[PDB]
Each structure stands twice: as C-alpha cells, then as structure tokens.
Amino acid sequence: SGFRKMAFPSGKVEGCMVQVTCGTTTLNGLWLDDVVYCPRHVICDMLNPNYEDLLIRKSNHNFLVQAGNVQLRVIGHSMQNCVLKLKVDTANPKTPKYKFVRIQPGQTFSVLACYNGSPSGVYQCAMRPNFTIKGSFLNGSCGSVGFNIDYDCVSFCYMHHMELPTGVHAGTDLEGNFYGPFVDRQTAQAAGTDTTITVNVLAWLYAAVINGDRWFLNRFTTTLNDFNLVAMKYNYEPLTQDHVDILGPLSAQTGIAVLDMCASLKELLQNGMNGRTILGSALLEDEFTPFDVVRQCSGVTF
C-alpha cells in the first residue's frame, strides 16, 4: 500500500555526471560514450550571444572536464542546437544503455540535480503544458538531466538550462531543442499560463481508489464533450480519446470507467474537496501519468 512521488533509481545516470568548467562558468555535463553533453551557454557578457562565433575561439583545452578527481581531455567540440558536444578521448566505462527521447507535455521524468558534476538529489516531476518544469534548482545546477528508465534503458529527455522569473525552470532535450518558447540568453522571458494535466489527475484518482481512498466516487458518468467544456473552464488540459484509451487498464482494474471518473473530477472541480483529502493531498495531483500509476501499483523494477 501507499502512493509516493517516486523517481527512477538514478544510479545509471550518476555514473554519467561530470563537471564542465570553461572560463569562469562551472556546470554539469553528461558523459556518454566518448562525448560530454552540456548547455551551450557555458561558452565564453554579450547578451544576444552568437554561440558559433564564440565557439571557434575556443580551444579544446579551454574545456576543463572533471570526472570525479580524474580530468578528461577534450579532443573536439561541436554544437547541436542549444547543447555543446565535447568529444573526449575516453569512453565512459559506466555508459548505460541509453536513448535520447523528446517527451510531450504532461509526461513525467526523474531529475538528477547536480552541482560541480556531483549528484546531490533526485526528484520526480512533469513537463508542464506550458513546457516549464517546477523543479528545484540552485546556481550551478545547469546541465542536470531528466530521464526515464525502461527496463535497462535510460531515456534521457531533459537537460536543465535556466530559471524563469517565476521560479519555474526551462531546458532542452538532449538534442538541444528547448521545451517551450524559450531561448538561452538574457532577455525578458516568462512562463505562459499553465494548465492542469487532466489525464494525470484521472490516473492519480485511480491510484487513490486502488489505495482504498474512495469518497470522491459518485454514481454519475459524463461525456467527453461535456467534460472538456468543464475542463476548459477550470484551465484543465483537454481529455482526448487517446487519454481515455491509455487509462483503460486502470478503468478495468478499478471498475470505474474514465467518463465515470471524469464525473467525479467535475464534481470536485465544482464543489472542492470539502476539507477532505485524497492520497494525503488537498489538491488534485497532476504529476503522475497513467503509466506511473500502473508501474508503482504493480512493482516494476530496473
């Protein structure tokens, strides 16, 4: 029993974390095979930077890459979108089975927060619909990475680049493409209005039911069209047929059809929780995907 905000075991990623220093900037790099990936803004105050330009001046020995107390030597440097690729002369013997994947808003992943190439914390979060992440990052955390694990395979999906003025965070995939309408320079940038991830709330309500927490269930069911009218009123993401289909396993396990659970969610959006809680929370959690709920409520291992 129990339901916790659960991250993937971070060991496969810890063995990949290195420190990258260049000029006065120090941040984290991801050492996979013989390449260290890191944010391109480690490059050498021009506030509308010309990254390629500044990069050609750079010598390989300008990039001080520190793997534990062992210093790697850079033998090449190239650039892909907002990520710098530093070719090193040694393949990481700890390189896990891995892929680079780009995730969709609403999908969850684990962040290994690092400082000076040293892992210091791991937490689970979701890519918000406004493409930010509500993370926990201090100065020096840039280059910390987000990931999922499937079996023995690490899917790297996120690299941290910056904090927005509201305190939420922005970054790229491992191919250097930003999540959301952000750029890696000093300019006025703001997170858009965020919305709640409806399918994840429903998944979490199924988790609550599996854990015996049932007071919000009601006899009623609604339509996809009626619910999305209510959802848009409450700044909830639209629920699609694909979302219903993905919730299928939880619907079958619980006896609660998705549109049946939607009538519960609607009631709750319109009436509140009335001082009651669900899985120890007085808010509707939206950072558990349907797969997270199945995975934590069945004990899948890595």
Tell me whether residue 60 is exposed, middle or buried, using C-beta atoms within 10 angstroms of its C-beta: 0 to 12, 13 to 18, 19 or more. Answer: middle
Residues of this chain, 136-155, that bind a copy of itself according to CB under 8 A: 136-141
Residue 173 per-residue DSSP state: -
Look at residues 101, 197, 108, 110 and name the one whose alpha carbon lies nearest to residue 157. 101
- Tell which positions 187-216 bind a copy of itself, by CB under 8 A: 211-212
Q: x/- string (CB under 8 A) for a copy of itself, residues 235-264? A: ------------------------------
267 to 286: interface string for a copy of itself, x by CB under 8 A: ----------x--xxxx---
CB of 125 to a copy of itself, least distance (A): 7
**Nearest approach, Cβ of 27 to a copy of itself (angstroms)?**
13
Q: Is 183 helix (H, G, I), strand (E, B) or coil?
A: coil
CA-based torsion, 17, 18, 22, 24: positive or negative: positive
Which of residues 20, 30, 88, 113 is near a copy of itself by CB under 8 A? 113
Using CB under 8 A as the binding rule, whether residue 116 contacts a copy of itself is answered as yes
Q: Distance between CA atoms of 171 and 187, rounded to whole angstroms?
A: 15
Q: Is 186 in the site for a copy of itself (CB under 8 A)?
A: no
Region binding a copy of itself by CB under 8 A among candidate stretches 34-42, 52-60, 121-129, 244-252: 121-129
In the annotation, is 16 catalytic?
Answer: no
User: Which member of 16, 38, 41, 114 is catalytic?
Assistant: 41
Under the criterion CB under 8 A, does residue 293 sit at the interface with a copy of itself? Answer: no
CB contact at 8 A, 91 and 33: yes
Longest dimension (CA), the chain: 69
| Residue 119 C-beta-side C-alpha neighbours within 13 Å | 18
Which residues neighbour 240 within 8 Å (Cβ) at sequence distance 6 or greater?
none
Q: Rule CB under 8 A: is residue 12 a binding residue for a copy of itself?
A: yes
Nearest to 220 by CA among 247, 255, 251, 259: 259
Residue 160 among the catalytic residues:
no
Beta bridge partners of residue 169, listed in sequence order: 133, 163
By the rule CB under 8 A, 96 interacts with a copy of itself: no
- Give 74-114 as a DSSP string: EEEEEEETTEEEEEESS--TTPPSEEE-PPPTT-EEEEEEE
At closest approach, how far in Å is the CB of 217 from a copy of itself?
Answer: 18
Residue 70 contacts a copy of itself per CB under 8 A: no
Structure tokens at 49: 């930077």
Segment near a copy of itself (CB under 8 A), from 78-86, 160-168, 176-184, 245-253? 160-168
Positions touching a copy of itself (CB under 8 A) are 1-15, 112-116, 118-125, 134-141, 163, 167-169, 211-212, 277, 280-283, 295-302
Q: Indicate which residues carry an active-site annotation.
A: 41, 142
